[PDB]
C-alpha cells in the first residue's frame, strides 16, 4: 500500500503472485468489520406474485421437461446471482402438481417443508409416510431418505428450507439415490411414538441429533399460541413480550432445535402489537402465515400481506407490527451461531 | 480377629474404643458384598386390604386428631421398623376425605402423586392449581410450594412417592411453611404452556432440573401405550419387547427424568406376555393400575390383582406375566444409580 | 397420635402391624427437618494418637493374623458403632508393614489413597504400577483392579477414603477377586500420557467417568498453591479468599471431579488467615498435612496439629484459622449432592 | 432447461429476474455433490521461499509504510484471489521486526500464534503478558484484547491462524480498538494457574468457551510425544497408530478443543512411519516443524522439508511419510464440522 514503489518492491510482488502469497499491507477491503455487514440485503417477496409465477410454472413446465424440479428459488439481490436467500440458507417455493411424485434420495444437508397451500401429499421419510397439510412443518433431517407422492388431483405449495449455502461454502455436501408402496396413513410412526406430551417411548431412550417427529401439525401450533395469549388475558406469564405469543419447534429427545443447523419458530402477535427492535447475529426468514401487518428493516417499513416472505441478514435491525392478529412462521441459522459462540443480541428495550 | 489375645492386645482395643477407632481385622460382616444384598426384601401389598384400612382410617381419624396426616405408609419388613418401602424411597397411600385441605409447605425432598381413585382435588404447586383424577401423575418437585384442596364430598386415594429415605440417610433435608383463593381450573398454567407435542414456549428457553409439567394426564398415557401395541400389530418397531408397550415420564426441557432422584414409567403388557427376568441396580415399586397377572421375585410367583403394589429391592431378579391386558405404574431410584455410574443390568435374554 | 383410643382403633393398629403399614399420624420423629441434622457429629482425631496405635498395630498384628487388614477405621461417635466417618464416606489409616503385599481385587465402590508417611510402595491399578510417596493422591476408581507391593523394609501410612457407607446404604456394592510381576517404574503409564498440562493424547479422545491419572504427585500440588499465594503478593486474582490458596483435584478428560462420588481438594492458608464460616450440604474430612492452626465447628474451637484429621457433617458451620502456613488435604461427598441438585451453601461473608 | 422455449416462457423468465426468483430447473451446476468437492485445492508452500520473501519484506516495508501489517497471507490458488488458505481458515506468516509493537484490539474471530523462529516477544492477552518462543502455541481467543511487543533487536516469525474466512462468509465479525506497561514475565498468570497437571484452581470452577491457557509451551509438547514413542517401545498402548505419536491441544476446563472454531494438534512420526490414507470432512493445515518426509494428496507425492506448510481441503485423501523423525504442527476447522454433525472419516485401514 504505502511501501516505496521501487524496482525491488515490484520484484517482491512478482515473487508473491508466483508463490501464491498475498501480503496484508496491500489489502484495502473490510478485513474485520466493526459489526457484521452482510453481502445479503433485506428483501421481501410478495405471495400474490410468487403464487402467480408458481401457477404459470405449473402450465409451462411439465414432468419430463423440468417439472421434477418445479421449484422457485428465492435469491438475495446481494448474493451475486446465487439462488440463496441468505449466506447460510436456501428457501424456495416447491409447486407440486396433480399426482406428482419424486423418488427417494438422501443428502447431508438438513431440510424442512412448511406447507402453505394444499393437502393430501405424503413425504415418505426413511420409509415412514408423513401426511402434509396447510400449516404443518415437516422435517427431512440430514441423511434421511426422503421422497414424496401427491395422492390428489390438486397441486400443493410448500416452503423448502435448506442449509445448502452453508453446506456449499463449508464443503460438507454428500448425496445418495435410493431404490414403490404409496401408503397414505393419517399420521406417521414418528408422530405416533413421539407426539404425546411429556411421554417418551422406552424403545427411544437414546437422544438424537435431529428430532424424530416427522410433522409438527398445525392443530398443536395453533393451540399453543392461543393458550399463551389467553394466559396473558388472565395475568399469567406466557408471552415473550406484551401481545407476542411464540413457540420454538424442538427435538423432544433433547429439548433443543429441530436440526443442528436450522431453528424453526412460530409467532402470533395480537393486533397492534409492535415488537422492540432487535439486532441478532446471523440470518432469519419469516413468512406471514395469516393476517396483516408490517416489518421495519434498517428503518424502512414494508407493509406485509398473507403469504409474504422476508429476510433479515446478520445484524440488520428489525421489528414487526401487527395490524390484525399477525401469524408468522420463522427460520434461521441461529443453532450455528450458538453452537460456535458467535451469537449476540441487542434489544431496543434493554 | 486372629491376633494373639494377649494383655497388650486388649490394651490396644481399649485404646481403640477410647479414640473411636474401629480396626478392619476384627470386622466380620459383609463389607463389600459380591453383588447387592439389600436389607429391604421383596414384598406385595394387596389393594383390597389397603383400601379397607384406608376407608376405616377415614372413620377413625378426623381432622384435629391425625386426619391431616391420614397417610398409610408402606414399610419394608426388612428395614428395622422404618416407614420406608425401599432404602431410597417412601411410598404411602394418602386418603383424603370430603372437602379436606392442606396448607402450603416446601421441602428439598422430591415427590410425586399418582391418583388411583377419585376426581376433583387440586394440588396447588407454586400458586399454579393442578386438577387430579384417576391415572394422573402429579409432580411436586423439590423446593416447590405445594398444598391442596378437595372440591368435593367424595374422598380420594393417591400414591405419595418421595425420596425421604435417601434424603434422611444422606442429610439433605430442608423444609419451610408457606402463607387462600381455592381456584378450580381444568388445566394448570404448566400444562397449558408445556403439553403441546414438540413445541416449547419462547418464554421457557432455560432448561430446568425438574419437569415444568404439573400433571401427566391419563388420556395421554393411554394413547401412547395403545399406539405402541397398534404399531406392533402393524409390523412397526415400538414396543421394548414383544407384547410390552412402555413409556417413561420425562421433563420436556431436557428429555430426561421427571425429577433428579426419581424415575416414573408406565407399562402396558398384552395378555400372555411374560417378561424376561431382570436384575437391575437399586429399587423399584410397581402398582397394578388395571388387569390381572403375576410377578416373580427370587423365583417366587405372586398373583397380582387391580391396585396391588410391590417392591423389587436392588439386584432382585424379577419379571411380570400378564393374564389379561396388564397396566402398571412404575417408579424407582434409577436416576440416582445412573447419575453416579452405579447402574448395572442383567437380562435373561442377553 | 391423637385419634380416640377405642377398641376399633386398636384393631386398626393391629391390622397395620400385620399388613406392614405404618400410619403417618402416629409418627413423632423429625420427618422432614428444617435443615440437615446429621446423626454424624463433628469430631477430631489426633495424629500423635493414631500413629501410636498404628505402630503398635504393626507389632501386634502380623500377616496371617489380621495384618492383611491392618487398617484403623475412623468411626463417627454418632453412627451407632459403624466404622463410618460420615454417613457417606469411609476413612481409615492403612498401616503397611515391611515388604507387605495385597493381591488384586475390584469393587464398584470408588476409592483414593492419600500418602501421609513413607515412600517406595506401588499400587498396581489395572496392571499399571503407580509409585507412592508423602503427599501423593492415588485413585483406584470403581471397577479398577488394584493391589499393591511394598518394595522396602520401611512401613507406610496412608488415608484410605472410600464411598463404602453410601454404597452400603444404597445397595450398589459389587466385588471380584483378580489373578505376580512386581515392577517398580518411577511414573505410571497414566501419568506419562496424562500429566502434561493442556495436552491430550489422540489415543484418549473418549471422556471417562473417572480420572485416568493414577497419581496426583506432591510436586505439582505444591507448585500450584505457591503460585496462587505469589499471584496474590503481585495484585493478581488467584486465591479464593484473601490468604487462601486452593486447588481441586480434577479428571482431565472432563474438567470434573476425580470420581463420581468423591471430591478431593488441597488447601494452603497463609499464616493468620481466618476463613469465613460455611454451612455446606453433605460431609467433608480434612487432614492437616503441614503447619498449625485450628478449626471451629458449631462454635467450638479445636487446636489442630500436623496430621490431625476432622469431620464436618452436613450443614455444620465450620471455619479454619492458620497459625503458621496451614496445608490441608480435603475430601467430601459433594459430587453426589451436586449431581442430584441437593447442594446448598451459606457463607458468613455473603 | 428443457421447458418449451416459447414466448410465454421467456415472459415467465423475465418476470423471474424482476422478482429475484431463480427456478431450480434451469440450474445446471453441482447443487448437492456426491461428496465434498472444494474450490480450495491441495497446496504446499516452501519455507525456504516464505522465509526469503519474509526477510525481504523486512527490508522493504518499514513501520509507517505497511510494516504494521507485515504479514504474508497464504492464498489457496482455488479461492478466487482471496487471502484464504481454505474456505474456513486464514493462515499467514507474521514477520515481526526488531523492537516492534502493536496496540491492543479485540475481534469476535478466534486466533492462535504458532512460533516458528525467534524468542522474547510478548503477546499481552487481556493484560496478561505471554512470552513467545520456537514451538509455543499461543491462543488469542475471540473477544480477548490482544497486542504485542518485541523486547529484542532480533525479528520473529509466527504462523497466524484465524477463522476469518468462516467469519466473513457467515457474517459474525465484530471488532474494537483498546487503549503501555511492557512487562516481560517468564510465564503468564494463565499458565501459573492452569499449567499444573490434573489440578484446577478453586477460583476457576466455571467452564470457559475457550482455553484459559495462554501458551502451550514447547517443553511440554515435546515430553508428551517422547513418552508416547517410549511407551510403544515398551509394549504399552499410547500411539494412535504404529510409529505415530500425537496430542491434541485442549481447553483444560472442559477437555475439549482450544477454541470453538479451531482444532490444534501436534504429530510426531518415527522414521519410516507411513500413515494410512484418510478422507476427513473440512480442511486442515500442517507445518513441518522438524525433520523430513513427504505428503500424498490426491495420489500426488510432495517431498517435504523443515518449515514447509500444506493444506488438505475437505475430503481430499491424504497421508504422511516420515523419512527422519517427522514433527508437524496441525490445525483445522474440525470443531465446526463436529459441533454441527457434519464430520465423517474414511481410513484406508478400516
Ligand atoms: Fe432432498
Ligand atoms: Fe409435601
Ligand atoms: Fe480395594
Ligand atoms: Fe488480532
Task: Determine the Cα–Cα distance for residues B54 and D322; give it in Å rounded to an integer.
Answer: 81
Task: Determine the Cα–Cα distance for residues D264 and D138; give it in Å rounded to an integer.
Answer: 11
Q: What burial class does residue D195 get, using C-beta atoms within 10 Å of its C-beta: 0-12 exposed, 13-18 middle, 19+ buried?
A: buried
Contact C321, C96 (CB under 8 A): no
Q: Please state the separation of Cα D99 from the chain's center in Å.
A: 26
- Residue partners of A117: CB distance under 8 A and separation at least 6: A51, A134, A156, A157
To which residue does cell 504479514 refer? D71
Asked if the Cβ–Cβ distance from A228 to B201 is below 8 Å, we say yes
Domain segments of chain B as ranges: 33-350
Check the annotation: does A71 bind a ligand.
no
Closest partner CB to C75 (pick from B15, B22, B342)? B22
Question: How many beta carbons lie within 10 A of that of residue A144, not counting itself?
Answer: 17
Is there contact between A and B if contact means ≥3 C-beta pairs under 8 Å?
A: yes
Task: Determine the Cα–Cα distance for residues C222 and B181; give it in Å rounded to an integer.
Answer: 62
DSSP B231: H
Task: Provide the β-strand partners of residue D43.
Answer: D311
Helices B47-60 and C7-19, axial angle in degrees (round to 10) = 150
User: Minimal CA–CA distance to D140: which of D125, D155, D159?
Assistant: D125
Question: How many beta carbons lie within 10 A of that of residue D300, not counting itself?
Answer: 9
Contact A290, A304 (CB under 8 A): no
- How are beta strands D318-322 and D293-297 bridged, if at all? antiparallel
Task: Determine the Cα–Cα distance for residues B273 and A162; give it in Å rounded to an integer.
Answer: 45
Question: How many beta carbons lie within 10 A of that of residue C103, not counting itself?
Answer: 12
- Residue partners of C133: CB distance under 8 A and separation at least 6: C115, C118, C119, C120, C217, C218
DSSP A291: S
Task: Determine the Cα–Cα distance for residues D85 and D161; give it in Å rounded to an integer.
Answer: 10
Q: Which residues of D touch C328 (CB under 8 A)?
A: none
- How are beta strands D128-133 and B284-290 bridged, if at all? unpaired
Q: How far is D253 from chain A (nearest CA, A)?
A: 16
User: Minimal CA–CA distance to B152: which of B128, B183, B118, B129?
Assistant: B118
Closest partner CB to C238 (pick from D203, D211, D231)? D203
Closest partner CB to A248 (pick from B202, B231, B255)? B202
The bound ligand whose nearest atom lies closest to the alpha carbon of D105 is 4
Contact D266, D249 (CB under 8 A): yes
Contact B118, B134 (CB under 8 A): yes
Residue A219: strand, helix, or coil: helix
Backbone angles phi, psi at C156, to 5 degrees: -135, 140
User: Minimal CA–CA distance to D317: which of D287, D267, D275, D277?
Assistant: D277
Determine if residue A331 is left, alpha or beta; phi over 0 gives left, psi from -120 to 50 gives alpha, anything else beta: beta
To which residue does cell 380416640 refer? C4
What is the DSSP annotation of D170-233?
HT---EEE--------SS-HHHHHH-STTEEEGGG-S--SS-S-SEE-HHHHHHHHHHHHHHHH
Asked if the Cβ–Cβ distance from B252 to A220 is below 8 Å, we say no
Asked if the Cβ–Cβ distance from B255 to A253 is below 8 Å, we say yes
To which residue does cell 428457501 refer? A91
User: Minimal CA–CA distance to A333: which of A77, A110, A44, A43?
Assistant: A110
Residue A56: strand, helix, or coil: helix
The bound ligand whose nearest atom lies closest to the alpha carbon of C147 is 3
Task: Determine the Cα–Cα distance for residues A300 and A293; give it in Å rounded to an integer.
Answer: 14
Asked if the Cβ–Cβ distance from A203 to B250 is below 8 Å, we say no
CATH superfamily of C33-350: Jelly Rolls (2.60.120.10)
Q: How far is A237 from chain B (nearest CA, A)?
A: 8
Instruction: Give the burial string for C5-27 (b: 16+ CB within 10 Å, else e).
Output: eeeeeeebeeebeebbbbbbbbe
Task: Determine the Cα–Cα distance for residues C293 and B65; give it in Å rounded to an integer.
Answer: 54
Question: How many beta carbons lie within 10 A of that of residue D245, not counting itself?
Answer: 28
- Here the cell at position B168 is 434422611
Q: How far is CA D126 from CA A116, B286, D141, D145, D215, in A?
A: 51, 58, 10, 5, 14
- Residue partners of B45: CB distance under 8 A and separation at least 6: B74, B308, B309, B310, C19, C20, C21
Task: Provide the β-strand partners of residue C123.
Answer: C130, C148
Task: Provide the β-strand partners of residue D176.
Answer: D106
- Here the cell at position B144 is 416447590
Q: What angle do CA B7, B9, B10 make, to 5 degrees?
A: 65
The bound ligand whose nearest atom lies closest to the alpha carbon of C142 is 3
Q: Please state the separation of Cα D208 from the chain's center in Å.
A: 21
Per residue, the 3-state secondary structure of D251-304, as one string, reads ECCCCEECECCEEEEEEEECCCCECCCEEECCCEEEEEEECCEEEEECCEEEEE
Backbone angles phi, psi at C181, to 5 degrees: -60, -55
Q: What burial class does residue C242 get, using C-beta atoms within 10 Å of its C-beta: 0-12 exposed, 13-18 middle, 19+ buried?
A: exposed
- Residue partners of C241: CB distance under 8 A and separation at least 6: C273, C275, C276
* For testing contact with chain B, the best of A199, A207, A265 (most B CBs within 10 A): A199
Furthest CA-CA distance within chain B = 80
Task: Determine the Cα–Cα distance for residues A168 and A88; give it in Å rounded to an integer.
Answer: 9
Q: How far is CA A269 from CA A125, A287, A327, C256, in A?
A: 33, 13, 6, 45
Report which secondary-structure segment, H or E, holds D131.
strand D128-133
Report which secondary-structure segment, H or E, holds A59.
helix A47-60
Furthest CA-CA distance within chain D = 80
Please indicate the experimental technique that yielded this structure: X-ray
Taken in order B298, B301, B302, B305, is the CA torsion positive or negative? positive
HSE-CB for D237 with a 13 A CA cutoff? 8
- Here the cell at position A87 is 449466506
User: Minimal CA–CA distance to A151: which of A182, A126, A110, A172?
Assistant: A182
Contact B93, B71 (CB under 8 A): yes
Task: Determine the Cα–Cα distance for residues C152 and C120; give it in Å rounded to an integer.
Answer: 7
Task: Determine the Cα–Cα distance for residues A166 and A331; give it in Å rounded to an integer.
Answer: 15
Residue C350 CA, ligand 2 centroid: distance in Å:
29
Furthest CA-CA distance within chain A = 80
Task: Determine the Cα–Cα distance for residues D282 and D338; give it in Å rounded to an integer.
Answer: 10
- Residue partners of B11: CB distance under 8 A and separation at least 6: none
- Here the cell at position C172 is 450398589
User: Minimal CA–CA distance to B167: which of B333, B341, B331?
Assistant: B333
User: Minimal CA–CA distance to D256: which of C260, C248, C258, C254?
Assistant: C254
Report which secondary-structure segment, H or E, holds A233.
helix A218-233
Per residue, the 3-state secondary structure of chain C, as one string, reads CCCCCCHHHHHHHHHHHHHCEEEHHHCCCCCCCCCCCCCCCCEEECHHHHHHHHHHHHHHCCCCCCHHHCEEEECCCCCCCCCCCCCCCEEEEEEECCCCEEEEEEECCCEEEEEEECEEEEEEECCEEEEEECCCEEEECCCCCEEEEECCCCCEEEEEEECHHHHHHHCCCCEEECCCCCCCCCCCHHHHHHCCCCEEEHHHCCCCCCCCCCEECHHHHHHHHHHHHHHHHCCCCCCCECCEEEEEEEECCCCEECECCEEEEEEEECCCCECCCEEECCCEEEEEEECCEEEEECCEEEEECCCCEEEECCCCCEEEEECCCEEEEEEECHHHHHHCCCCCEEECCC
Contact B151, B122 (CB under 8 A): yes
- Residue partners of A70: CB distance under 8 A and separation at least 6: A57, A58, A61, A94, A95, A96, A97, D23, D24, D25
Sequence-ordered alpha helix ranges (H) in B152-291: 164-170, 189-194, 218-233
User: Minimal CA–CA distance to C262: which of C88, C23, C17?
Assistant: C88
User: Minimal CA–CA distance to A32: which of C30, C317, D140, B300?
Assistant: D140
- Here the cell at position B298 is 427370587
Task: Determine the Cα–Cα distance for residues C210 and C206; give it in Å rounded to an integer.
Answer: 12
- Here the cell at position D284 is 486442515
Q: What angle do CA B203, B122, A247 make, to 5 degrees?
A: 15
CB pairs under 8 A between B and C: 258
User: Minimal CA–CA distance to D152: which of D90, D100, D206, D84?
Assistant: D100
Taken in order A177, A179, A180, A181, is the CA torsion positive or negative? negative
Task: Determine the Cα–Cα distance for residues D73 and D91; give it in Å rounded to an integer.
Answer: 6
- Here the cell at position A312 is 433479515
Report which secondary-structure segment, H or E, holds A116.
strand A111-117
Q: Which residues of B touch A247 (CB under 8 A)?
A: 196, 199-202
Interrupted backbone of chain B, residues before each interruption (C–N > 2.5 Å): 179
User: Minimal CA–CA distance to A224: which of A209, A212, A240?
Assistant: A240
- Residue partners of C228: CB distance under 8 A and separation at least 6: C238, C239, C245, C246, C268, D193, D201, D203
* For testing contact with chain D, the best of A81, A171, A261, A343 (most D CBs within 10 A): A171
Report which secondary-structure segment, H or E, holds B102.
strand B101-107
Task: Determine the Cα–Cα distance for residues D88 and D260; give it in Å rounded to an integer.
Answer: 13
HSE-CB for D298 with a 13 A CA cutoff? 10
Contact D100, D63 (CB under 8 A): yes
Helices A47-60 and D7-19, axial angle in degrees (round to 10) = 150
Residue A285: strand, helix, or coil: strand
Task: Provide the β-strand partners of residue B288.
Answer: B328
Task: Determine the Cα–Cα distance for residues B140 and B283; give it in Å rounded to an integer.
Answer: 21
- Residue partners of D68: CB distance under 8 A and separation at least 6: A25, D102
User: Minimal CA–CA distance to C316: which of C290, C288, C284?
Assistant: C284
Task: Determine the Cα–Cα distance for residues A90 and A101; give it in Å rounded to an integer.
Answer: 22
Question: How many beta carbons lie within 10 A of that of residue C206, not counting itself?
Answer: 6
DSSP A290: E
To which residue does cell 401412547 refer? B224
- Residue partners of A256: CB distance under 8 A and separation at least 6: A250, A335
Task: Determine the Cα–Cα distance for residues C145 and D145; give it in Å rounded to an integer.
Answer: 49
Amino acid at each position: 500500500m504505502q511501501p516505496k514503489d521501487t524496482p525491488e518492491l515490484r520484484a517482491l510482488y512478482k515473487s508473491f503472485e508466483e508463490e501464491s502469497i498475498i501480503p496484508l499491507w496491500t489489502q484495502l477491503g473490510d478485513l474485520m468489520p466493526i459489526h457484521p455487514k452482510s453481502k445479503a440485503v433485506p428483501h421481501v417477496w410478495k405471495w400474490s406474485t410468487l403464487l402467480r409465477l408458481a401457477r404459470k410454472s405449473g402450465e409451462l413446465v411439465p414432468v419430463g421437461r423440468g417439472g421434477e424440479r418445479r421449484h422457485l428459488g428465492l435469491a438475495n439481490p446481494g448474493l451475486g446471482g446465487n439462488a440463496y436467500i441468505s449466506p447460510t440458507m436456501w428457501a424456495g417455493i416447491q409447486y407440486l402438481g396433480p399426482r406428482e411424485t419424486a423418488p427417494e434420495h438422501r443428502h447431508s444437508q438438513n431440510a424442512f417443508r412448511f406447507v402453505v397451500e394444499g393437502e393430501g401429499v405424503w413425504t415418505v421419510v426413511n420409509g415412514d409416510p408423513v401426511r402434509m397439510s396447510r400449516g404443518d412443518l415437516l422435517l427431512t433431517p440430514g441423511w434421511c431418505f426422503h421422497g414424496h407422492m401427491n395422492d390428489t388431483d390438486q397441486p400443493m405449495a410448500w416452503i423448502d428450507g435448506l442449509d445448502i449455502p452453508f453446506s456449499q461454502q463449508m464443503d460438507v455436501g454428500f448425496f445418495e439415490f435410493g431404490s414403490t408402496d404409496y401408503a397414505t396413513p393419517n399420521f406417521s410412526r414418528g408422530e405416533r411414538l413421539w407426539c404425546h406430551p411429556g411421554l417418551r417411548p422406552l424403545s427411544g431412550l437414546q437422544n438424537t441429533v435431529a428430532s424424530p417427529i416427522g410433522a409438527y401439525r398445525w392443530e398443536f401450533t395453533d393451540r399453543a399460541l392461543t393458550e399463551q395469549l389467553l394466559l396473558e388475558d388472565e395475568g399469567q406469564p406466557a408471552t415473550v413480550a406484551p401481545g407476542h405469543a411464540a413457540i420454538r419447534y424442538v427435538n423432544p429427545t433433547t429439548g433443543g432445535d429441530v436440526m443442528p443447523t436450522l431453528r424453526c419458530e412460530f409467532h402470533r402477535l395480537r393486533a397492534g402489537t409492535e415488537t422492540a427492535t432487535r439486532n441478532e447475529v446471523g440470518s432469519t426468514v419469516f413468512q406471514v402465515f395469516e393476517g396483516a401487518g408490517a416489518v421495519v428493516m434498517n428503518g424502512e417499513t414494508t407493509k406485509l400481506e398473507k403469504g409474504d416472505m422476508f429476510v433479515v441478514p446478520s445484524w440488520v435491525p428489525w421489528s414487526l407490527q401487527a395490524e390484525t392478529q399477525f401469524d408468522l412462521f420463522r427460520f434461521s441459522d441461529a443453532p450455528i451461531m450458538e453452537a460456535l459462540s458467535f451469537m449476540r443480541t441487542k434489544i431496543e428495550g434493554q
